[PDB]
Amino acid sequence: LSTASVLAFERKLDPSDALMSAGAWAQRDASQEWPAVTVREKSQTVDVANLPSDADTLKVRFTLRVLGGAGTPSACNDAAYRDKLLQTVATYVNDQGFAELARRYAHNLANARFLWRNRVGAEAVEVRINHIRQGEVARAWRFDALAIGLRDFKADAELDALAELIASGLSGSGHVLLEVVAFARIGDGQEVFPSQELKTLYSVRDAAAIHSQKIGNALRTIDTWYPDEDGLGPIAVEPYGSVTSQGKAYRQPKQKLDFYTLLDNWVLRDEAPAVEQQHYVIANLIRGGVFGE
């Protein structure tokens, strides 16, 4: 009949803080003892994180758990709204499962978009994704991140295999944890761009790193179904789909394509189109958030 006063969706596709470490190209195989890059200060005064002078390659590394059961909220206030939401996500996956969203997540893990600023000036990027079964490597991938585009979604055998593995983890048929390690050729003594704190760069234990929410924002840029002119490309799935650095807000609620109007039409009165906005609202609840009255 109505929406609950409190509604909480927990995070799926759980990332970690991407630890960064310098190294040389063609040494990506035995890249375990690689020294982590640290933040220095210079001339009011600012922070800067470069590489060591004998290293032409950055390597970031983070572990991504995927959870599954994304349509089950962690908090509600009425049982009827949770039953209706579970029925809508259940008939979503019974019409078509996680085949488009898992393919786009495998794309955003294939092209190293979690390299936020380090990707745009990189000569060659290689992403290695290891599916850690018990404590060892079960299936290992080796993706050309620059050959796979940022705004076009290709078709490939290995990428559809990664899409099927992320789909199996997202449906709940298996536990999926992926060690994702990206080698980016940037140059000798070039500058890396970790996440900046409240200019102070973020670090954990004498090691510059990217935040977990920045990596979670980067692999979430899959939204291509919105009334923009063609040329923007994929944006991240936020409700009232915003780019606060650009100062614009696509799917503003005067147009009826935001997350909340599509949710309260797709659940409370059974109204959404065939493929596009259902994928948008399901990816938005895959992200998680706080909704309600």
Binding site: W116, R117, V120, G121, A122, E123, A124, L146, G149, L150, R151, D152, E191, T221, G231, L232, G233, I235, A236, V243, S245, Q246
Partner: protein, 189 residues
């Protein structure tokens, strides 16, 4: 007839848009490209995309005739991006006459460097190095900004580009490029 080829590049939107840094990586990769190619025969401009004269355009146009163009940063001779631009392909130019000029300039907004150069040049004293003739009273400045981190052995520059006289007055056949990476008389739209 001056340099009769152009590339109407259009940097697409992207939820990461530091324009100083996008044009920084682009002009830096162009610097790398043309120092690898080698030659003072190339053009670069920025058409009327600066709406105010503060911002700088989201476009570009390179002016090399045939061979330098096709061999330099283009569909061949990798950019390394091929996704954030999805740009096109060049062709012959029309016949305008806005007098065809662009310019580079740099100013002084950090008199520490000048005072240190005085101290180094003939061993100046601290009091005169403090008040011989710094510009501490006023800090000069320039509007159109691009970052362009150092090619090597240095740190973050802040380069400034002033469109020259773009008056619909005349035209002339001059040199190919000044500076290092920036054509001279270039056709403008």
């Amino acid at each position: 007839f001056t340099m009769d080829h152009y590339l109407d590049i259009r940097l697409r939107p992207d939820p990461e848009f530091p324009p100083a840094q996008l044009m920084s990586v682009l002009f830096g990769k162009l610097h790398q490209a043309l120092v690898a190619q080698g030659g003072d025969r190339i053009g670069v401009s920025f058409p009327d995309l600066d709406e105010s004269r503060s911002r700088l355009g989201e476009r570009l146009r390179i002016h090399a005739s045939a061979d330098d163009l096709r061999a330099l940063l283009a569909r061949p001779w990798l950019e390394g991006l091929r996704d954030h631009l999805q740009f096109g392909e060049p062709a012959v130019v029309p016949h305008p006459t806005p007098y065809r000029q662009v310019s580079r300039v740099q100013a002084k907004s950090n008199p520490e460097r000048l005072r240190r150069r005085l101290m180094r040049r003939h061993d100046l004293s601290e009091e005169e190095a403090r008040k011989r003739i710094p510009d501490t009273v006023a800090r000069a400045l320039d509007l159109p900004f691009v970052t362009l981190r150092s090619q090597s052995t240095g740190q973050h520059f802040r380069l400034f580009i002033r469109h020259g006289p773009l008056q619909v007055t005349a035209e002339e056949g001059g040199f190919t490029c000044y500076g290092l990476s920036k054509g001279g008389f270039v056709p403008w739209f």
